[PDB]
From Swiss-Prot, chain A:
Tissue specificity statement from the Swiss-Prot or TrEMBL entry: Detected in fetal and adult kidney. Detected at the thick ascending limb of the loop of Henle, at distal tubules, including the distal convoluted tubule and cortical collecting tubules, with weak staining of the collecting duct. Detected on placenta syncytiotrophoblasts (at protein level). Strongly expressed in ovary, fetal and adult kidney, testis, and small intestine. Not detected in peripheral leukocytes.
Chain's gene name: PKD2
Locus of motif Selectivity filter: 398-400
Transmembrane segments: 226-246, 263-283, 310-330, 355-376, 412-432
Protein name stated in the entry: Polycystin-2
Swiss-Prot record, chain B:
Function, in words: Component of a heteromeric calcium-permeable ion channel formed by PKD1 and PKD2 that is activated by interaction between PKD1 and a Wnt family member, such as WNT3A and WNT9B. Both PKD1 and PKD2 are required for channel activity. Involved in renal tubulogenesis. Involved in fluid-flow mechanosensation by the primary cilium in renal epithelium. Acts as a regulator of cilium length, together with PKD2. The dynamic control of cilium length is essential in the regulation of mechanotransductive signaling.
Boundaries of every PLAT domain copy: 49-160
Organism, as annotated: Homo sapiens
Post-translational modification comment from the UniProt entry: N-glycosylated. Cleavage at the GPS region occurs through a cis-autoproteolytic mechanism involving an ester-intermediate via N-O acyl rearrangement. This process takes place in the early secretory pathway, depends on initial N-glycosylation, and requires the REJ domain. There is evidence that cleavage at GPS region is incomplete. Uncleaved and cleaved products may have different functions in vivo.
Known outcome of mutating A618P: In PKD1; uncertain significance
Extracellular topological domain residue ranges: 220-244, 289-290, 351-565, 621-648, 713-754
Outcome recorded upon mutating G268R: In PKD1; likely benign
Residue numbers on the Cytoplasmic membrane side: 36-198, 587-599, 670-691
Domain notes: The LDL-receptor class A domain is atypical; the potential calcium-binding site is missing.
Residues of the full protein shown: 3061 to 4120 of 4303
Protein's name in the database: Polycystin-1
Ranges that cross the membrane: 15-35, 199-219, 245-263, 268-288, 291-311, 330-350, 566-586, 600-620, 649-669, 692-712, 755-774
Similarity comment: family membership: Belongs to the polycystin family.
Illness association: Polycystic kidney disease 1 with or without polycystic liver disease: An autosomal dominant disorder characterized by renal cysts, liver cysts and intracranial aneurysm. Clinical variability is due to differences in the rate of loss of glomerular filtration, the age of reaching end-stage renal disease and the occurrence of hypertension, symptomatic extrarenal cysts, and subarachnoid hemorrhage from intracranial 'berry' aneurysm.
Length: 455, 784, 92, 92
């Protein structure tokens, strides 16, 4: 099943799409691309620019084949999320030289009023329910599914005219907070849709933060014989899961009411729970293909495929975790000679001590992480968030770090932090684990050999 | 017309309530373990005062029976209970048992005692003098027997038979149930042979604390349809009628549910109830402006104090023994130390992580300021004539180019002359940082240069300010003095002033520094940012650029009772307490004890706490002074803010260091588990060998660093074959830039030596020691 | 056992990052990338931006269980075997 | 013994990648490149391109047998010598 779902090289599909849209410079004279956007004028140059070049390919109003294989489904859609003027309080002694400040993005401080030349949907607020949208959880914050949206055209000239009209009557002012661009392609050669979403965040403090998402999906599954084979395998997997559930329930109900001091029964229930969640997600997702049917009967409208991509990502994560745990479960059966039994005995005997020391090790690790976050968290770009500090220290263990950046943030306490971290991490904490493991292995082997040879 | 209103907040989160609740739950988690240990100590077992005087009276005839006796006697922080003992005689008729046990009856020399036997049948006519005790270790009793006779099993009163009055019956209970029913101060005063389990009491106490917090949070976040419960009359400052009036009401209304569980299933019910209480408190905590969280904390503290002193005091109106006593005393000491440390940790966490929302915004603000000011272009200038074009093309459009985050104050340029015009080295090879430094000029100069006609020069010295200076340049330390140029207010006049300075040789002659720096405000996140741009000039044609953007939050001392103020005063009190304790110990328990570790860590902690508190207070005062100076008038006055940012950074660093020390000490105290005490022991048992190994490693690293820089200095373009491959450089700059010209600072040497020590596996030698030690300690706790 | 765990991690990384990173685009590529991770010559920016959750988790868990639990077991086995062999030969 | 095994791998690398990679052009280049690999300075791009099979095999086997077995044998000797010296000193 995992080989079937992880199909042949679809890496090149998303690679070509990304390199077409992300790595292309915004203009023949500029050197900036989407990945390195700097300001709002750069965004405007990209919109009427590399985006239009990569979207419409020339070959009554013929359709667009992006690589002469990828078919552009419907039209792309652009959307904007902005806050309102007056959602922001300033000190009364400063209300003489400054008049306008805009709060950070929040559902309570959103703007829901017409602005500019109020003619169409680009200057009128449309609710999330009316847009069939949902949250996104971007980088700065989690954005709603509503805003001011515009549906582009099928040809390049009309889309360029629409973008020029949007730019002339200023559409991205200081009140804007997020911008989304969405579209999809088919690529009929293989059977694999692709959904593209580009997001640009305008934080209150200033700047531009870009992000992208290219996701391949399969919604017409049953086409070839391998598809029927995969369906049969999925049904067999469902039968296996049902059998495991029945066995687990029967073998916990008849006796063994404790059932949890084994670690080979908790793993089974974890695997069962994850697999049942995956089955439920797949069942709920595969039946919601009504958007495809709605689009196929009218191919001049934006197709909504974001929910399917989100659920596909969730299903992929769940399946990966489930297969990892199923592979881990193999340790229960590798006991077939005196050599492999004593290693398992050593691991099981040293697990308690390893956990006991790992508690202290993680406490010290988090002390280092919090100190680094509080000291370097505003200047280094690698300690800006707590989890980023944890990952940075884990990379420091590997030696994948730049010492130049940490010392120039603080001449003192900079070298001290790195020096003490490396010393106390490689000279003390790394050796106690070895001491414990070696002592446990030595005692296990010694007692086993002495009781076996004196019997 | 009150009902209830749903807060319905944004996605923001308030960390004060969450931190307080987490601390209050983890402290109970530790309480449960300690109290369970003490309970199992006193579960089955344990169910000077005694001297060598005649404690038996065998002259009586038929004056005894098989029963038990007891003696109730209280005193100054001393009490007792009942007694039960027997031997082979099984308490025969008129048995004279001159013996005493190791009872906890450590009473004083007071004339208050009540001795009562057990009415084994009818009323006994026994006439025994007393259990006489005169002096064994401390002489806590008196050698006098009253031989008073009471009724059947009646408590015969005496000093060191029909008295039934409130002056004796009820006043006797003023010391009996005084601290047993006072549930707060009763976890270490539980009389034995009772069904309390010492875990129900702690569960009820945490129930009370959690419900106090929840009620106060609900009142401050939901019931606010009367006086906006914010700003109008409920100011953050203590008004004495809004902070305590809510705590008392919350305690009164929460007693009815607390009294419902008193003396099974109560444990789970209390667990789920405190879970829902903390959940609702966290949910309502989001709608909390920063000025009302301190009020909520004060209300909670006042409610706890009132419950501890207001209602519970009136609630009552409705061989092997020495080691056991030492162990229980140690447990009590550990318990109170745990409480004090938990309070200290909560105070430190509030001091450091009080404002965690601005920490994420400050980084983005400073990054945006750097990227919008063309930091790379400014940092790459080397000639003293491109600064004016850079200002013309970058800085001026940034100040008067109306956009987000207004400047809030005009910029300024400050120069030092040095009066010692330097002869520059011919261009080409670099010079070692800077050289040929003299003194700083102070005289005045008119338009152009030195030319006084009537009075003082047009370009006055503008003497340095008392507070806020010492930028700490690349190879020099400056102040806040120097000739200043206002740069103008409007864009048009700024161009004229810049041209006037360029044409009149304002900088070309000496050119020591420029000091371009104004300010910047961001009201969306409420953060200020001090921007400093400096051109340090070692010699003519040699330029060193420095850019520093420091974001901070302007918290003023005049704002009232801010959270930093409360944390600072609490830290000062804690530092005073620790200093007094350590000074008392150092003065009483001998002298000259600084020879060993343990008398240094406490002093370090005291110094760190005092430094944190004083730095925070100084930052608040400096911010208040600077704001008061700036507000009085802003036509063109500069009123820099660099000192406030530096003080804020120092305070944050000190708080982080204190929290680090507290977390390390918390990790240290994990040894109290039976099987987890070995690890730290080995770490303190292998210290000399580790110190010898690290001395050898220091010598080897110094040798390598000497070897690894005497041949990378030979950079040119080809070092060697073996020395190029078998060489280690610490992480960063994988492809070596070579040629350490005036950049072989101390830090890179330590970096490269320490990293080379690891790669070659020299640090793994520590295992060779540690393993052996771990094999010895673990064998000394199995057989013996 | 070491290679069982290695292959489990490689399969997890192939399923998670198999379409975006290009260092996990193939199973053998996943194995080679995992071997290179020990050497500490990876990016971690592309793999963190490919999956904000379950991406860093994989990296941190792999590093912890690979430097702290697995290398020390090899060295413990070697140490014990060497000590036993030396003692046996000395007694001989 | 370690140098014998090191020379075996160096000769294998010279005979396989000695004409495309430019890091194995001569024998001393192979030796120095392997030493640099031990200190974590791998490239793995030219190695992969020059030979899709027997290229990754060499790298994986070298890393496994160098960072898990061979370099873990010096520490066993040092540990046993330390244990014997300490025991002798304590007994005497
Ligand atoms: C010239 C006179 C004195 C010169 C002195 C200069 C010596 C320069 C520093 C040496 C280190 C100190 C002794 C360390 C040896 C004891 C500890 C040890 O060897 O560690 C093991 C092997 O490591 C290694 O690389 C081992 C590299 C070689 C070091 C072993 C000693 C070789 C000595 C052969 C002849 C000596 C007698 C002749 C001298 C006259 C495991 O490591 P680790 O898991 O952490 O892997 C991490 C991975 O990134 C590095 O491969
Ligand atoms: C923004 O709102 C303020 C009042 O808060 C008003 O003075 C200003 O004119 C507004 N800006 C506009 C109209 O763009
Ligand atoms: C949302 O979906 C409905 C179909 O259920 C469709 O009629 C409507 O046009 C969609 N919304 C937009 C903005 O197109």
């Amino acid at each position: 099943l995992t080989y079937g779902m992880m199909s042949s090289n679809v890496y090149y599909y998303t690679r070509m799409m990304s390199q077409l849209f992300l790595d292309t410079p915004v203009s023949k004279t500029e050197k900036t691309n989407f990945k390195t956007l700097s300001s709002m004028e750069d965004f405007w140059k990209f919109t009427e620019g590399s985006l239009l070049d990569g979207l419409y390919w020339k070959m009554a109003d013929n359709r667009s084949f992006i690589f002469y294989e990828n078919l552009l489904l419907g039209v792309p859609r652009i959307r904007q999320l902005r806050v309102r003027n007056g959602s922001c309080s300033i000190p009364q002694d400063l209300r003489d030289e400054i008049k306008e400040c805009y709060d950070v993005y929040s559902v309570s401080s959103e703007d829901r009023a017409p602005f500019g030349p109020r003619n169409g949907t680009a200057w009128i607020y449309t609710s999330e329910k009316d847009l069939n949208g949902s949250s996104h959880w971007g980088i700065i914050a989690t954005y709603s599914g509503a805003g001011y949206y515009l549906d582009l055209s099928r040809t390049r000239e009309e889309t360029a005219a629409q973008v020029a009209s949007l730019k002339k009557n200023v559409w991205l002012d200081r009140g804007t907070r997020a911008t989304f661009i969405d579209f999809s392609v088919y690529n009929a050669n293989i059977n694999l849709f692709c959904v593209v979403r580009l997001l640009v965040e305008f934080p209150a403090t200033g700047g531009v933060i870009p992000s992208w998402q290219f996701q391949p999906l399969k919604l017409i599954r049953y086409v070839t014989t391998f598809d029927f084979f995969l369906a049969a395998c999925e049904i067999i997997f469902c039968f296996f899961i049902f059998y495991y559930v029945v066995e687990e329930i029967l073998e916990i109900r008849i006796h063994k009411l404790h059932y949890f001091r084994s670690f080979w029964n908790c793993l089974d229930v974890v695997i069962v729970v994850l697999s049942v969640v995956a089955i439920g997600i797949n069942i709920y997702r595969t039946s919601n293909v009504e958007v495809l049917l709605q689009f196929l009967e009218d191919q001049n409208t934006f197709p909504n495929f974001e929910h399917l991509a989100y659920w596909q990502i969730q299903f992929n994560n769940i399946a990966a975790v489930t297969v990892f745990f199923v592979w881990i479960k193999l340790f229960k059966f590798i006991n077939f000679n005196r050599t492999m039994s004593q290693l398992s005995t050593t691991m099981s005997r040293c697990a308690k001590d390893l956990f006991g020391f790992a508690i202290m090790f993680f406490i010290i690790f988090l002390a280092y992480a919090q100190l680094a976050y509080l000291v370097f968290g505003t200047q280094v770009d690698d300690f800006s968030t707590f989890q980023e500090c944890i990952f940075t220290q884990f990379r420091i263990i590997l030696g994948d770090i730049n010492f130049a950046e940490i010392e120039e943030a603080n001449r003192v306490l900079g070298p001290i932090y790195f020096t003490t971290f490396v010393f106390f991490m490689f000279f003390i904490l790394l050796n106690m684990f070895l001491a414990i493991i070696n002592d446990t292995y030595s005692e296990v082997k010694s007692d086993l050999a002495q009781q076996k040879a004196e019997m | 017309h009150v009902r209830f209103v749903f807060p319905e907040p944004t996605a923001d989160v308030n960390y004060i309530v969450m931190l307080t609740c987490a601390v209050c739950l983890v402290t109970y988690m530790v309480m449960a373990a300690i109290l369970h240990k003490l309970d199992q100590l006193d579960a089955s077992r344990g169910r000077r005062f005694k001297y060598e005087i005649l404690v038996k009276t065998g002259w009586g005839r038929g004056s005894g029976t098989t029963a038990h006796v007891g003696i109730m006697l209280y005193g100054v922080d001393s009490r007792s209970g009942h007694r039960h003992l027997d031997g082979d005689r099984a308490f025969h008729r008129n048995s004279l048992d001159i013996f005493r046990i190791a009872t906890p009856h450590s009473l004083g020399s007071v004339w208050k005692i009540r001795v009562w036997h057990d009415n084994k049948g009818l009323s006994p006519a026994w006439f025994l003098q007393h259990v006489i005790v005169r002096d064994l270790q401390t002489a806590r009793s008196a050698f006098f027997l009253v031989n008073d006779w009471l009724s059947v099993e009646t408590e015969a009163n005496g000093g060191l038979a029909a008295l039934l009055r409130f002056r004796r019956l009820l006043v006797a209970e003023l010391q009996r149930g005084f601290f047993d029913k006072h549930i707060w101060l009763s976890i270490w005063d539980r009389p034995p042979r009772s069904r309390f389990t010492r875990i129900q009491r702690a569960t009820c106490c945490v129930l009370l604390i959690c419900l106090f917090l929840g009620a106060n949070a609900v009142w401050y976040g939901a019931v606010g349809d009367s006086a906006y419960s914010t700003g109008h009359v409920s100011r953050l400052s203590p008004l004495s009628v809004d902070t305590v009036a809510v705590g008392l009401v919350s305690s009164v209304v929460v007693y009815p549910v607390y009294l419902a569980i008193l003396f099974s299933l109560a444990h789970g019910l209390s667990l789920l109830l405190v879970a829902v209480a903390v959940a609702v408190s966290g949910w309502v905590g989001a709608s909390f402006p920063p000025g009302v969280s301190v009020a909520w904390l004060l209300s909670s503290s006042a409610s706890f104090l009132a419950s501890f002193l207001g209602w519970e005091p009136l609630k009552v109106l409705l061989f092997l023994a020495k080691e056991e006593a030492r162990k229980v005393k140690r447990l009590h000491g550990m318990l109170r130390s745990l409480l004090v440390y938990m309070l200290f940790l909560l105070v430190t966490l509030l001091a450091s992580y009080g404002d965690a929302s601005c920490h994420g915004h400050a980084y983005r603000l400073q990054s945006a300021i750097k990227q919008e000011l063309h930091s790379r272009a400014f940092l790459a200038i080397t000639r003293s004539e491109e600064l004016w074009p850079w200002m013309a093309h970058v800085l001026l459009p940034y100040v008067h180019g109306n956009q987000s985050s207004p400047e809030l104050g005009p910029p300024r340029l400050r120069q030092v002359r040095l009066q010692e015009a330097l002869y520059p080295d011919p261009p080409g090879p670099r010079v070692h940082t800077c050289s040929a430094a003299g003194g700083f000029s102070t005289s005045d100069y008119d338009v152009g240069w030195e030319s006084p006609h009537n009075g003082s020069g047009t370009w006055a010295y503008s003497a340095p300010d008392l507070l806020g200076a010492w930028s700490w340049g690349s190879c020099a330390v400056y102040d806040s003095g120097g000739y200043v140029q206002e740069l103008g207010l409007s864009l048009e006049e700024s161009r004229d002033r810049l041209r006037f300075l360029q044409l009149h040789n304002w900088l070309d002659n000496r050119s020591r520094a420029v000091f371009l720096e104004l300010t910047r405000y961001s009201p969306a996140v409420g953060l200020h940012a001090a921007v400093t741009l400096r051109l340090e000039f070692p010699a003519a044609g040699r330029a060193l650029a420095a850019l520093s953007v420091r974001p901070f939050a302007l918290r003023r001392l005049s704002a009232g009772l801010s959270l930093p103020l409360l944390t600072s005063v609490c830290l000062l009190l804690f530092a005073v307490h620790f200093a007094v304790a350590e000074a008392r110990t150092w003065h009483r328990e001998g002298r000259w004890r600084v020879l060993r570790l343990g008398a240094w860590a406490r002093w370090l902690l005291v110094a760190l706490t005092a430094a944190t508190a004083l730095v925070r207070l100084a930052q608040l005062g400096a911010a208040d002074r600077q704001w008061t100076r700036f507000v009085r008038g802003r036509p063109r006055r500069f009123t820099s803010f660099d000192q406030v940012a530096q003080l804020s950074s120092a305070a944050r660093g000190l708080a982080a260091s204190l929290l680090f020390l507290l977390l390390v000490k918390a990790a240290q105290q994990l040894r109290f588990v039976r099987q987890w005490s070995v690890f730290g022991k080995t770490l303190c048992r292998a210290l000399p060998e580790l110190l010898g190994v690290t001395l050898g490693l220091v010598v080897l690293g110094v040798a390598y660093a000497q070897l690894a820089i005497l041949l990378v200095s030979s950079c040119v373009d080809s070092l060697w074959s073996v020395a190029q491959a078998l060489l280690v450089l610490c992480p960063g700059t994988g492809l070596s830039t070579l040629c350490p010209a005036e950049s072989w600072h101390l830090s890179p040497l330590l970096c490269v030596g320490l990293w080379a020590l690891r790669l070659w596996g020299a640090l793994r030698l520590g295992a060779v020691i540690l393993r052996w030690r771990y094999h010895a300690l673990r064998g000394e706790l199995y057989r013996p």
